[PDB]
Swiss-Prot record, chain A:
It comes from the Eukaryota. The gene is NUP98. The modification Phosphoserine is found at S155. It comes from Homo sapiens. The chain holds residues 1157 to 1631 of 1817 of the full protein. Transmembrane segments: none annotated. This is Nuclear pore complex protein Nup96.
Swiss-Prot record, chain B:
It comes from Homo sapiens (Human). The gene is SEC13. Its main location: membrane. One of its GO terms (biological process) is protein exit from endoplasmic reticulum. This is Protein SEC13 homolog. At the nuclear pore: component of the Y-shaped Nup107-160 subcomplex of the nuclear pore complex (NPC). The Nup107-160 subcomplex includes NUP160, NUP133, NUP107, NUP98, NUP85, NUP43, NUP37, SEH1 and SEC13. At the COPII coat complex: interacts with SEC31A and SEC31B. Interacts with SEC16A. Interacts with SEC16B. Component of the GATOR2 subcomplex, composed of MIOS, SEC13, SEH1L, WDR24 and WDR59. The GATOR2 complex interacts with CASTOR1 and CASTOR2; the interaction is negatively regulated by arginine. Belongs to the WD repeat SEC13 family.
């Protein structure tokens, strides 16, 4: 009768069963038939994927940089000195990830000029320095690619070209000298010279491509470079695009385009307009963001809705540095949204302390208060045990809030006051 | 044999459970290890869902059942006795839920007779029960509370006190505590082609864009949305459809990740992309 009775219950209930709901500190539990409870404490997978984050010391160091001023009621970050540069220490130089942070730093992070100067030219000098670092870095990545190609090249002239891609004028000049291409060698030294020599050279190319039954393919390429507009001119090294890394080509533009006339941003933009890059390539998107200086935010949203090359963490870190730096301007709401999911991604990890810290950089006071409050009380037990964790409450959590959550803990604990 | 619902305690310390054997077991999870603590038996029929009250009222846990009765078990020094019981419905009671701790200590129960009781607590062992007859046509399965939202004086605000609820009629009716004293059905939501199984009122990350999820026999999961405060507009959007029924749905707290339980004994996780379309982040188990 029990058997019949049970079946009776099921059909009316229309019961088939599986069950799952979020647990209070966002985990998931479903029915294990294997566990004795018949419930499984599922460690929610952490989307957040980054070694240093787990380590407590980075969080502490990170706090020192920030200056927390109260909101009116709650906390809020006011000065922040976070730099993409900082992250590098906590990363393998080899890792591509380090590359993204490093490049982002060279472009984005503020550059300091120790030497005193008159004033206005400082901007001029500073750009050169930044340009110098940036161009140098690109050469690092390109280097294996270029060198491999040169080793295979069966000519004297092509390599002289290849060295130039390397951004090594001197070696190319030397090779030219050795090759007997004496005249070319002299012209080569002109490179890195924004001089108006470009016009004469373009003239030479024009004259050639208006007759010139014969000119070496590579010699022309070198001339295309001195012209200053390598890929935006007629006798384009656009075709080269298939052959070399997009990055490799970008360097040529950066190195010879016309450094003085245009700013680093506009210049990079100039190159970018010419070629379309993999959407997925992270390194590439960063350049877009850099170049996009006038709609950085506007580009950011489309980067978001296209690929996920940017990790959740990076997006947040990027927004925060730029904002604090006054390097760029970003939507308060967009900035918060970026923060929220980061704060959440951290929470899922169980890194409540770190998660709380991030929550602080939230423009919306109402949202911040709710978010921080909810977390503090729920989690109050863990937050107490270490100084690093001590400092966390020390950040700017209101005193009432701290004890208040504590009180609730007591009632539950059944040991009060 | 087979459990039905099991929910972790606030402060993640205990873990109440209930299965079709009419037994409400409270385990304890310190360090990841499960350890029973009491087997509260008392239902003439299998227990369905179970919910922990807010530690602000001591340590309470309520469980409903197919026995048409609902039980509330208090705790006084290890003394897990039931301080109150309530059999105000004629048919089984598919679900229970507690109102956000600020409204007070209110408990919502949806039966299978198509009703909905609401136990409010008073000074002592007393409980008034404002009830809602014929709330759903063939019965009710889900009951979820709308997140406590705050609206120059010494007063604790009067909240909009809403709470959704799906049922056997396919409608997911929302509800509201009228200023005078009784609840009324602010709106209906008919997007499901068969029984609504569960309905979960996502918690507001302070954000005003309140959402709500539902799953039903048809095997579709909708995430109904409200574009702004005070505009009676709930525009459903389809999460996904499986060829088999979906039994439960729950919201992860921060990200608003949906745990979709149902279909092939499998449970799925979903997060709404920067694009608006919802995706499956992974497969559990």
């Amino acid at each position: 009768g029990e058997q019949l009775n049970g079946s009776h219950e099921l059909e009316n209930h229309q019961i088939a069963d599986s069950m799952e709901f979020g647990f209070l500190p966002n985990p998931v539990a479903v029915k294990p038939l294997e566990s004795p409870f018949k419930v499984h404490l599922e460690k929610l997978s952490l989307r957040q994927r980054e070694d240093m984050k787990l380590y407590q010391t980075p969080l502490e160091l990170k706090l020192k940089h920030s200056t927390v001023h109260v909101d009116e009621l709650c906390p809020l970050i006011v000065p922040n000195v976070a730099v993409i540069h900082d992250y590098a220490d906590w990363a393998q130089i080899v890792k591509h990830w380090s590359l993204t942070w490093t490049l982002c730093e060279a472009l984005w992070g503020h550059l300091k000029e120790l030497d005193s100067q008159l004033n206005e030219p400082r901007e001029y000098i500073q750009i050169l320095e930044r340009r110098r670092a940036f161009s140098r870095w690109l050469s690092c990545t390109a280097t294996p690619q270029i060198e491999e190609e040169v080793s295979l090249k069966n000519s004297p002239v092509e390599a002289v070209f290849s060295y130039l891609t390397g951004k090594r004028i001197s070696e190319a000049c030397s090779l030219a000298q050795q090759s007997g291409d004496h005249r070319l060698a002299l012209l080569l030294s002109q490179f890195v010279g924004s001089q108006s020599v470009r016009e004469l050279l373009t003239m030479q190319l024009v004259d050639w491509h208006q007759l010139q039954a014969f000119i070496q393919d590579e010699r022309l390429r070198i001339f295309a470079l001195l012209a200053g507009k390598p890929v935006q001119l007629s006798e384009k090294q656009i075709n080269v695009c298939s052959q070399l890394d997009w990055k490799r080509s970008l360097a040529i533009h950066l190195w010879y385009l016309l450094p003085p006339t245009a700013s680093i941003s506009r210049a990079l933009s100039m190159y970018e307009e010419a070629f379309q890059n993999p959407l997925r390539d992270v390194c590439f998107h960063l350049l877009k963001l850099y170049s996009d200086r006038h709609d950085l935010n506007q580009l950011l949203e489309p980067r978001s809705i296209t690929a996920d090359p940017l990790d959740y963490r990076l997006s947040w870190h990027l927004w925060e540095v730029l904002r604090a730096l006054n390097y760029t301007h970003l939507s308060a709401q967009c900035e918060g949204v970026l923060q929220a999911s980061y704060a959440g991604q951290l929470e899922s990890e169980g890194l409540w302390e770190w998660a709380i810290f991030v929550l602080l950089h939230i423009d919306n006071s109402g949202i911040r208060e709710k978010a921080v409050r909810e977390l503090l009380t729920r989690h109050c037990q863990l937050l107490e045990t270490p100084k690093e964790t001590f400092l966390t409450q020390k950040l700017r959590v209101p005193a009432k809030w701290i004890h208040e959550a504590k009180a609730v803990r007591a009632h539950m604990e059944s040991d009060k006051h | 044999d087979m459990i039905h619902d099991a929910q972790m305690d606030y402060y993640g310390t205990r873990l109440a459970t209930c299965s079709s054997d009419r037994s409400v077991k409270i385990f304890d999870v310190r360090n990841g290890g499960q350890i029973l603590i009491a087997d509260l038996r008392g239902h003439e029929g299998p227990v369905w869902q179970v919910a922990w009250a807010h530690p602000m009222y001591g340590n309470i846990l309520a469980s409903c059942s197919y026995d048409r009765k609902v039980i509330i078990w208090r705790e006084e020094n290890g003394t897990w006795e039931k301080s109150h019981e309530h059999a105000g419905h004629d048919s089984s009671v598919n679900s229970v839920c507690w109102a956000p701790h600020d409204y007070g200590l209110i408990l919502a129960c949806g039966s299978s007779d198509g009703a909905i009781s609401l136990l409010t607590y008073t000074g002592e062992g007393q409980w008034e029960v404002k009830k809602i007859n014929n709330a759903h046509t063939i019965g009710c399965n889900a009951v979820s509370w709308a997140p406590a939202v705050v609206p120059p004086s010494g007063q604790k605000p009067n909240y909009i006190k809403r709470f959704a609820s799906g049922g056997c009629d396919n409608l997911i009716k929302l509800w509201k505590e009228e200023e005078d004293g009784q609840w009324k059905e602010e709106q209906k939501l008919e997007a499901h082609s068969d029984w609504v199984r569960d309905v979960a009122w996502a918690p507001s990350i302070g954000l005003p864009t309140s959402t709500i999820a539902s799953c039903s026999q048809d095997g579709r999961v909708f995430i109904w949305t409200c574009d702004d405060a005070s505009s009676n507009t709930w525009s459903p959007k389809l999460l996904h459809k499986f060829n088999d029924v979906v039994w439960h749905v729950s919201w992860s707290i921060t990200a608003n990740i949906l745990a979709v339980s149902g279909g092939d004994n499998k449970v799925t996780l979903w997060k709404e992309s920067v694009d608006g379309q919802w995706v499956c982040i992974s497969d559990v188990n």
